[PDB]
Amino acid sequence: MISLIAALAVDRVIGMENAMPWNLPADLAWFKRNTLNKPVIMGRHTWESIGRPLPGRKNIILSSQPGTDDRVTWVKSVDEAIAACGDVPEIMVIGGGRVYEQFLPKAQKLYLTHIDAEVEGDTHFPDYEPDDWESVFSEFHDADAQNSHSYCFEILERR
Ligand SMILES: NC(=O)c1ccc[n+]([C@@H]2O[C@H](COP(=O)([O-])OP(=O)(O)OC[C@H]3O[C@@H](n4cnc5c(N)ncnc54)[C@H](OP(=O)(O)O)[C@@H]3O)[C@@H](O)[C@H]2O)c1
Ligand SMILES: Nc1nc(=O)c2nc(CNc3ccc(C(=O)N[C@@H](CCC(=O)O)C(=O)O)cc3)cnc2[nH]1
Ligand SMILES: [Mn+2]
Ligand SMILES: [Mn+2]
Numbered sequence: 001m002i003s004l005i006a007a008l009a010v011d012r013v014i015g016m017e018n019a020m021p022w023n024l025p026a027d028l029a030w031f032k033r034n035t036l037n038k039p040v041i042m043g044r045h046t047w048e049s050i051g052r053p054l055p056g057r058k059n060i061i062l063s064s065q066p067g068t069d070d071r072v073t074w075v076k077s078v079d080e081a082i083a084a085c086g087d088v089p090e091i092m093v094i095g096g097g098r099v100y101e102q103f104l105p106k107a108q109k110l111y112l113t114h115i116d117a118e119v120e121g122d123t124h125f126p127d128y129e130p131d132d133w134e135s136v137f138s139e140f141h142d143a144d145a146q147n148s149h150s151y152c153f154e155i156l157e158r159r
Helices: 025-035 044-050 080-085 097-103
Strands: 001-008 014-015 038-043 059-062 071-075 091-092 109-115 133-141 153-156
Touching: 001 025, 001 097, 014 025, 014 153, 025 109, 025 153, 038 044, 038 080, 038 097, 038 133, 044 133, 059 097
Parallel strands: 001 091, 001 109, 038 059, 038 091, 059 071
Antiparallel strands: 109 153, 133 153
C-alpha cells in the first residue's frame, strides 16, 4: 500500500527555492506521527531540503545518480524504490513534486495538510482528480502562538 503525505498551501504550492516557507510545528508533528516506523520514499531534491535522515524510518532516495550517503538507501526507479521498502503494510511517499506525480497513480491514500497561507512557489502537489478520492478524516486547527496559519489535516482514500 502506497500513500502520499504532503502539506499544501494555496494553489497546491508545496515548496519554493528548495524549502517549505512556512513554519507549522503541529504539521511537522502530524508528519512524524504518520510516517514513523514506515519507509519513506523521497526525491533527491527533497533529501537535500531536509538535509539529514529522518530517524525511525527507512529513508529511500530516488536519484538517477549514484548515492552519496550510506545512512539512507538509494534507488534509480519507482519500482526499485517500492521493492526496497520490502514487505511492509504502508509505504509513505514524502515528495517532492516530481516524485508525487509518479507515485499518485499507484497511491491508495493521501494525507494532505491544507495550509491557509499565500506563498509564492516553484513546486506544486499534483493536480489530482478530486473525484477519485473520498475524504475519510478532516481536522481543522486555528492558528495559535506556535503555528502562525490555520491548517486542516485530511486523509483521503481512493474510491
Ligand atoms: N510541502 C510538502 O509537503 C513538501 C514535501 C516534499 C518536498 N517539498 C518541497 O518540494 C521541493 C522539491 O521537489 P522537486 O519536485 O523539486 O524534487 P523531488 O521530487 O524531491 O526530487 C526530484 C529528483 O528525484 C530524482 N527522481 C525522481 N523520480 C525519479 C525516478 N523515477 N528515477 C530516478 N530518479 C528520480 C531525480 O534526482 P536526479 O536529478 O539525481 O536524477 C530528480 O531530480 C522542495 O521545495 C521541497 O521543500 C515539499
Ligand atoms: N504534512 C506534511 N508536512 C510537511 O512539512 C512535509 N514535509 C515533507 C518533506 N520535508 C520535511 C522536512 C522536515 C521534516 C522534519 O524535520 N520532520 C521531523 C520533525 C518531527 C517533529 O517536528 O515533530 C520528523 O521527525 O519527522 C520532515 C519532512 C513531506 N511531507 C510533508 N507532509
Ligand atoms: Mn495564513
Ligand atoms: Mn476534501
